[PDB]
Design a protein around this ligand. Structure first.
Ligand code: MET
Ligand code: MET
Ligand code: ZN
Ligand code: ZN
Lengths: 545, 545
């Protein structure tokens, strides 16, 4: 029924995808896949965030154009996300003509509407390289404890914090020259002019309660004008009419969501859907899945930019917490800082997808990848509860009954119990209460396994003229599997494909109301194998390096 | 992909085909034709129901063998159905060796399995003719109001109902002798032994909800043993080992479905498909299209007979309501009791096929042939919405562009809108929501006609060096027609043939994904003409007689 546009945050082009990213893209993909199952028109959009000083400097160090470097990271990123079956409809780039034209448009509209201010500021500058320095590119000795080689606004030996202008004997991280303070004109977005609009939006009840609470802290501290320009030398979009000035990365980044959607419409030759989704009167829904470190940009600057440039604002923001491994922030030294590519050398995508999904909820809370629990959970739930219903029953059907399932359900009441749960489960996928959905699905799997145990096919199989009873029991367990794999289809796309090939049918949400009767099933290899702690040790060792 | 066996009810051999029959055979044929379009192996089976007392007596009155009479009605019936392009794979007879052998088989299996009981009953008998009389062949004076010449169990002057044994001064309709009560041994099928099986089948959710509800009324009233024998003199199959006893027509009639399929396999030299479709372990589907007056036989007696004789049961029953003309039951006196042969003297088959299809749905509801609406609908939808797309555009292509269609689509987006609707439309044909399918198809036809109107070919045609624009517009309307005629191909077989000859291509469901480009089309007579109320008055007058 509805038209929905969903995004994940745009990953920086200067680093590889890691499990932190993966939590977000998996969360979003499960939700998107469920929405497609319910018949909605869904557009899942992402892109690399490819601008900024860090990127410019990285390319220079490497001796290649920033364009070449971002082109390489974009392919690396898309290869990893494809390996996790993240079902984007379009994956584009913030460094694109669509994003350029939209950034220029929104800025001009903001400026014509009075929201752009000019003010001179003073910042540390490298006279040798000939560039202003962001804080992280200034180093020197801490003014408090006199420890040398400290970077930016804080000291990693005494913990003091200070403006980098307080550093003793400051040095440019780029060239080693001594930086000096230099004036520069900057352009500022007048966020404060949207305060009332944003406060109303905050109290709507749409946003998560935790996000709303955070926003009240930000209004209390006081909204400020936002510096949205950077001087040359920069890798980004040049500001119209302002030679040597560029849009700050964060101004163009969220416009990249629009740019990626415009690109998809344009490649499809679709001249109507861009305005249908982004004009102020849209009836389409717009959702952004993001992490808690970037909520300020998506909940205050972004909606204000859209309002101020006559576009619709987000229908909701869906925020998730950080990932932890073994309970702690990811650690390079313990080998728990794991890239997405490295993960796929050791385990399949489905396992991590399942694990994260079993833990996620509609709140913001850190999600822990406990590696010991990961093995125990995947083996218990996937191999032993869900896939077991197929693996314990298929052999008999294929060997004794020519792959044909019985003509009637052995236990129609039990089947109805399973199809009756569809409403609560789909409501849980829809409300992002993933943990709740998995708990309902696994309680059904426990009932189906109890059913099989109470019928004892391993006993019926060796007894007298009980061929009919065997076929009935085994068909019954295979239909329960059909239903469970339907509920899990958003979570486990490749196991789902294997189950559809076995069952000789695509799984649709409504399809569970018609059990498979007098139906041929195919033989199969092994639908899902067990994993073990040896594999996890290998993963951790590979990541240590 | 699948193997599907479809039937319509077997028409009695003692009456000509009328519009009531035609509603059913058209419904079924549209569904069958759609299933063939999707690549399934389909077997559409029917036959005449040729046994029973009414038939025996009719033949006697006529002075010809019952075999001669049924042979004549069979040809009349097949001629009418062929005139409506009802695409049977086989049209056989209940009076056939295949049906005899199968009836004898099923009865013996039922009897060996304990389902056949013997009981003596008493019935009115004609001592002069020497035959038991069914209720309709007894006449006399109503015991309540004393009105003479009343037939059977009810009085057409005071409305009373009674057993014909209550009639005053009873007379045989056959000879005029006074009937007397006489005993006779009869054979009974033990329906009640299948009650639990039938209740489970009822609650499966397969059957239409309205049918399920009706079945609960029947279980509530209580299933009874079914008298399946008739004494001699009879026109039917004699019961093995029971001289002078015959199977009741209704016992052998549905076995006729099997007999017709066996006949088709045997004529094809196919020794495997009979068992592949009728054995208990079949993976083929079996569907019976029937009317609501015969649901008791198809939903209770039939599946019980098949179970009891070790054959598979129906996959589903598809039930339709009655036909009405001008809102009322068909009336001989108003000339609304219309034979199929008479219809074809006045109108083509396609028109009635379209009209019924636009009204049908997946429920049981009477279908009204409103004659005024019939004219208005066929002219509006067939002539003016669908055929118009071809008739308004072909002339230009043939006269100015040598019958050649443009090398590209003028409006690729609009075309994609049409090919994107294929899923919902095919789902509507498949679910028997015919009315919904036609509504989607006509909404597309409205869009295609709007397209042509917005391009105004009648204006472009008279202007400057706009030959290219004209060819583009006209080719575009002809491709939209291609797509619409594809969706309607199950409904309008002869218009479809005319459209394929014009387009120089067979229409296939997948074929719409490749528009006709740089392609030669042929000239045409007139694809479909308008009809008018004068024709309907003629039809009504002819039927009055
Ligand atoms: C428009 S979302 C940009 C997100 C940013 N690249 C980061 O990874 O935090
Ligand atoms: C096996 S269906 C028989 C139908 C019956 N001849 C009637 O027309 O009602
Ligand atoms: Zn310090
Ligand atoms: Zn009376």
């Amino acid at each position: 029924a509805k038209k929905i546009l969903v995004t994940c945050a745009l990953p920086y082009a200067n680093g590889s995808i890691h499990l932190g990213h993966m939590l977000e893209h998996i969360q979003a993909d499960v939700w998107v896949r469920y929405q497609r199952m319910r018949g909605h028109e869904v557009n899942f959009i992402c892109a690399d965030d490819a601008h900024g000083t860090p990127i410019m400097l990285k390319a220079q160090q490497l001796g290649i154009t920033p364009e070449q470097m971002i082109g390489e990271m974009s392919q690396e990123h898309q290869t990893d996300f494809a390996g996790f079956n993240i079902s984007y409809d379009n994956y584009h780039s913030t460094h694109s003509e669509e994003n350029r034209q939209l950034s220029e448009l929104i800025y001009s509209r903001l400026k014509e509407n009075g929201f752009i201010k000019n003010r001179t500021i003073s910042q540390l500058y490298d006279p040798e390289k000939g560039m202003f320095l962001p804080d992280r590119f200034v180093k020197g000795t801490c003014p408090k404890c006199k420890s040398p080689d400290q970077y930016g606004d804080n000291c990693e030996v005494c913990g003091a914090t200070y403006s980098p202008t307080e550093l003793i004997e400051p040095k440019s991280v780029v060239s080693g020259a001594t930086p000096v303070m230099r004036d520069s004109e900057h352009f500022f977005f007048d966020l404060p002019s949207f305060s009332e609009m944003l406060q109303a939006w905050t109290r709507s009840g749409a946003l998560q309660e935790q996000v709303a609470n955070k926003m009240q802290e930000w209004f209390e501290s006081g909204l400020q004008q936002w510096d949205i320009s950077r001087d040359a030398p920069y890798f980004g979009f040049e500001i119209p009419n302002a030679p040597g000035k560029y849009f700050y990365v964060w101004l163009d980044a969220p416009i990249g969501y629009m740019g990626s959607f415009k690109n998809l419409c344009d490649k499809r030759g679709d001249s109507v859907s861009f305005d249908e989704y982004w004009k102020k009167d849209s009836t389409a829904e717009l959702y952004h899945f993001i992490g808690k470190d970037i909520v300020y940009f998506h909940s205050l600057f972004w909606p204000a930019m859209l309002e101020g440039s006559n576009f619709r604002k987000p229908s909701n923001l869906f925020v998730h917490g950080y990932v932890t491994v073994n309970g702690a922030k990811m650690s390079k030294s313990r080998g728990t800082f794991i890239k997405a590519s490295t993960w796929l050398n050791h385990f399949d995508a489905d396992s991590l997808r399942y694990y994260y999904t079993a833990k996620l909820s509609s709140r913001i809370d850190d999600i822990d990848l406990n590696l010991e629990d990961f093995v125990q959970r995947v083996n218990a739930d996937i191999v032993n509860k869900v896939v077991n219903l197929a693996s314990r029953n298929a052999g008999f059907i294929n060997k004794r009954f020519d792959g044909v399932l019985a003509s009637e359900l052995a236990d129609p009441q039990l089947y109805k119990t399973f199809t009756d749960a569809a409403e609560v489960i789909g409501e849980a996928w829809e409300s992002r209460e993933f943990g709740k959905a998995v708990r309902e699905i696994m309680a059904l799997a426990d009932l189906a396994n109890r059913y099989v145990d109470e019928q004892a096919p391993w006993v019926v199989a060796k007894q007298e003229g009980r061929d009919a009873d065997l076929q009935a029991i085994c068909s019954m367990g295979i239909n329960l599997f059909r239903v469970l794999m339907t509920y899990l289809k958003p979570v486990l796309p490749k196991l789902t494909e294997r189950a559809e090939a076995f069952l000789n049918t695509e799984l649709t949400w409504d399809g569970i109301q018609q059990p498979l009767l007098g139906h041929k099933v195919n033989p199969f290899k092994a639908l899902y194998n067990r994993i073990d702690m040896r594999q996890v040790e290998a993963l951790v060792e590979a990541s240590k390096e």
